Amino acid sequence: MSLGAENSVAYSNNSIAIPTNFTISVTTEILPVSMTKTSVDCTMYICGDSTECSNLLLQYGSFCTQLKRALTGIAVEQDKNTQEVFAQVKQIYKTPPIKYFGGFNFSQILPDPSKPSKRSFIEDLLFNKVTLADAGFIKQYGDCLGDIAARDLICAQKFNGLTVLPPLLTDEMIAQYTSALLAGTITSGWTFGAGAALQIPFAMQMAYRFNGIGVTQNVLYENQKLIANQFNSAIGKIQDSLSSTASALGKLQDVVNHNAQALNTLVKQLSSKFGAISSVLNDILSRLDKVEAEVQIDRLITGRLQSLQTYVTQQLIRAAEIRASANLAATKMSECVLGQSKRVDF
């Protein structure tokens, strides 16, 4: 493997290098915030519509109560993550109908009223790129009851006691929060994050941004057209690279793929025998007397309980990672969008 291109910077004790021009660069950072909320019914997954197995399951204590408590804590934590990332503004700001901000073009990131879900062009591309797993956040028992084509994985997950809970904030509310943050950042600057929103022209705000980084503010007032053209070209390049390349959003797709794969493995674990004569509960009930079927049912109960405990532990570890990523995203929302950062590579 190659580490990089070879270079040799020319150091001298009376020589310096000073730039004579500049470029404006727009880069894209993607951070996961939340994941899929799930709830598991123990009696339907382990036994399923059976009374003897339920009476044997009640003899094991409170494993399922603490499994349900852990899943409920994860489900509350996901909504808390989304709320601490996005809900940072006190008021919903609106952009003026005039669209002149010193020659800077913000049309591809500001929303448009042509569609009922007020999302921008880049937001629409990001939503179309990530292929969802078609979770059960919308009720789908009517489609599961009607046997059409072939049986799907969602119906097989639902019939065994696994249910996906819908998030508290819809995509329209996240889009409204994003639009409010964009309107406040475009009009007021960093003043809306420290109190009331004090208006300022965008050229003078960007001149303050140049004074932040160590450049005199006359540079913008002499190169405003060049800087606006560079920003517009960078935004168009971002739109082109998001229309062309589909591998940039691999983190959110990895989150969706993991959340689907865990439930698929949990469904597939129900076909194991775990040393019993059969993996089917009713065949054990109808083929044996009381004591031998009690032994086989207890073997199946131990196996299914171990698989469910493994699923809950893996979900807890994934929720810890997602909470760390959401804390980073909330810090980046407070420090990059609501202000200007002097931290290098942040």
Ligand X SMILES: *[C@@H]1O[C@H](CO)[C@@H](O)[C@H](O)[C@H]1NC(C)=O
Let me know: does 54 contact 44? Beta carbons within 8 Å: no
The Cβ of residue 241 has, within 10 Å, a number of other Cβ atoms equal to 11
Q: How far apart are CA 204 and CA 32, in angstroms?
A: 34
Segment 254 to 313, residues that bind a copy of itself, using CB under 8 A:
265, 268-269, 271-275, 281-282, 285, 293-294, 297-298, 300-301, 303, 305, 307-310, 312-313
From candidates 41, 79, 124, 152, binder to a copy of itself by CB under 8 A: 79
* Cβ-contact 267, 156 below 8 angstroms: yes
Say if CB 253 and CB 128 are below 8 A apart.
no
Q: How far is CA 159 from CA 109, 135, 181, in A?
A: 42, 14, 42
Q: Which of 144, 262, 276, 330 lies at the binding interface for another protein (CB under 8 A)?
A: 144
Minimum CB distance to a copy of itself smaller for 51 or for 114: 51
Give CA–CA dist 193/187, Å, rounded: 12
Site for ligand X in 142-161 (CB under 6 A): 142
Are residues 159 and 144 in contact, defined by beta-carbon separation less than 8 angstroms? yes
DSSP state of 297: H
Please select the residue that binds a copy of itself; options are 154, 174, 220, 242, rule is CB under 8 A: 174
Burial class of residue 244, CB neighbours in 10 A (0-12, 13-18, 19+): exposed
The answer to the question of residue 291 lying near another protein (CB under 8 A) is yes
12 is a contact residue toward ligand X (CB under 6 A) = yes
Judged by CB under 8 A, the residue of 70, 126, 165, 238 near another protein is 165
State which of residues 277, 302, 327, 337 lies at the interface with another protein (CB under 8 A): 277
Residues 88-127, one symbol each (x = binds ligand X by CB under 6 A, - = not), give: -----------------x-x--------------------
Residue (93 or 231) nearer to ligand X, CB: 231
Assess contact for 67 and 40: CB atoms under 8 A: yes
Pairwise CA distance, residues 40 & 256, whole Å: 18
Q: Is 124 in the site for a copy of itself (CB under 8 A)?
A: no
Residues that bind another protein (CB under 8 A): 39, 41, 43-44, 49, 68, 72, 79, 136-142, 144-145, 147, 149-151, 153, 156, 158-160, 163, 165-170, 172-173, 267-268, 270-271, 277, 279-280, 282-283, 285-292
